[PDB]
């Protein structure tokens, strides 16, 4: 038991105010303090505040004092954090955490999944999924290496997979790089020259931020055409 | 805030070896109730930090015995008696005996292994992309070691330094090796005007740079 489900990725426009939730279960939501923490991409963890659901009593560090508003719905075991007047700095990943070490047979240190926020005035953009294959039958011997390029998309979350996750071996997905308001991901998979092209290999890409669900397929080819 | 200072900030270890991280605080961590709430987490990339040891020496459930906690007042130490590929991540020490709960800067444990030369692969623009007016050439330099590498895009023999996207993957929990994709982008037009496309990387493993290339419109 004990699990904190947080709300999914949020895109916000500077000056706006997001609102995220964290649903707790497995312990008495009304009896302990729940902490909210921000992990700016640059590793370091920093505590924002905490709230006692039971009596709705809060606590915030001087910084987040005018930047965060904690709230909780006890009948729903759900706490809410709301960041106001957003900026570039407000971009980080926020976790909700529950700690308790005073009872031996009931130690609690659990974290939510994290609610990644992206503060940008930028506009959503579906990705361009291009399969990547070797021209002609030029195989190193034993293995071939296919690829998939995903580019020109925003916001940051993208779900690349191979043969619907049935291909977990020999794959490498590289971090999305941002190139002026637009991301780019790529991934390679390495199978034996015996499998492909005799056995299909597909690259399944999804960009939920714009409901895109592409299934590009790596077909063999010839001299750049 | 009570400052948690860790050291070393980067930690090179071979497998099987032993390691230690030291954590220290601005003020004592002994709570009025007599307990010392100093814990150590391990954040894997992309996942939330996870508890390893609470109240200086207590190991959380499932944590291997390889981990030990010790320390007092203001000076604390985490120890890995034996290092395995799983240990890959950043280790933090935290404080919850005071408000605010605070954390150290982190300590990336970097594995050491034998050398491995990258596996290069060049991929010509796709028909689907060319139609759009662009030509992204891609090079994958897979499973190499160490992390020190540089790739070169020599179009017709000339060092193209423009429109190249490099992205690396963290050290692998399987290989303890790295990978990266260099990606050169031209216009269909520019792409058309040249015949040779070379991706060559200089990496420890070889005195002669690893070269990979293709002649446009040929096998």
């Amino acid at each position: 038991e004990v699990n904190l489900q947080q709300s999914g990725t949020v895109l916000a426009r500077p000056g706006a105010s997001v609102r995220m939730s964290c649903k707790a279960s497995g312990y008495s939501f009304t009896s302990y303090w729940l902490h909210w923490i921000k992990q700016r991409p640059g590793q370091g963890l920093e505590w924002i505040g905490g709230i006692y659901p039971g009596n709705r009593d809060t606590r915030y560090t001087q910084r987040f004092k005018d930047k965060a508003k904690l709230t909780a719905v006890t009948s729903a075991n759900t706490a809410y954090m709301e960041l106001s007047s957003l900026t570039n700095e407000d971009s980080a990943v926020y976790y909700c955490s529950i700690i308790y070490f005073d009872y031996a047979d009931f130690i609690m240190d659990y974290w939510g999944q994290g609610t990644t926020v992206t503060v940008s005035s930028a506009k959503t953009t579906a990705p361009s999924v291009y399969p990547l294959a070797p021209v002609c039958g030029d195989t190193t011997g034993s293995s071939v290496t296919l690829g998939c390029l995903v580019k020109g998309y925003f916001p940051e979350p993208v779900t690349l997979t191979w043969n619907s996750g049935s291909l977990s071996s020999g794959v490498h997905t590289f971090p999305a790089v941002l190139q002026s308001d637009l991301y780019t991901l790529s991934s390679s998979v390495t199978v034996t020259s015996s499998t492909w092209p005799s056995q299909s290999i597909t690259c399944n890409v999804a960009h939920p931020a714009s409901s895109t669900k592409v299934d590009k397929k790596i077909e063999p080819r010839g001299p750049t055409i | 805030d009570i400052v948690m200072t860790q050291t070393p900030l980067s930690l090179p270890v071979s497998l099987g070896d032993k390691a230690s991280i030291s954590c220290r605080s601005s003020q004592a961590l002994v709570h009025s109730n007599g307990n010392t709430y100093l814990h150590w987490y391990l954040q894997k990339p992309g996942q939330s930090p996870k508890l390893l040891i609470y109240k200086v020496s207590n190991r959380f459930s499932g944590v291997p015995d390889r981990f030990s906690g010790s320390g007092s007042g203001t000076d604390f130490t985490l120890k890995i008696s034996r290092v395995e590929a799983e240990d890959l991540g950043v280790f933090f020490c935290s404080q919850s005996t005071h408000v605010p709960r605070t954390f150290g800067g982190g300590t990336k444990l970097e594995i050491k292994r034998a050398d491995a030369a990258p596996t290069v692969s060049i991929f010509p623009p796709s028909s689907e992309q060319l139609t759009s007016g662009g030509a992204s050439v891609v090079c994958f330099l897979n499973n190499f070691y160490p992390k020190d590498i540089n790739v070169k895009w020599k179009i017709d023999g000339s060092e193209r330094q423009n429109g190249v996207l490099n992205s690396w993957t963290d050290q692998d929990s399987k290989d303890s090796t790295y990978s990266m994709s260099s990606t050169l982008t031209l216009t269909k037009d520019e792409y058309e005007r040249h015949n040779s496309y070379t991706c060559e990387a200089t990496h420890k493993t070889s005195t002669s740079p690893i070269v990979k290339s293709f002649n446009r419109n040929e096998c």
Partner: peptide, 9 residues
């Protein structure tokens, strides 16, 4: 009881 970190006080 308990602190803001759920400790007995």
């Amino acid at each position: 009881t308990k602190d803001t970190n759920n400790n007995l006080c």
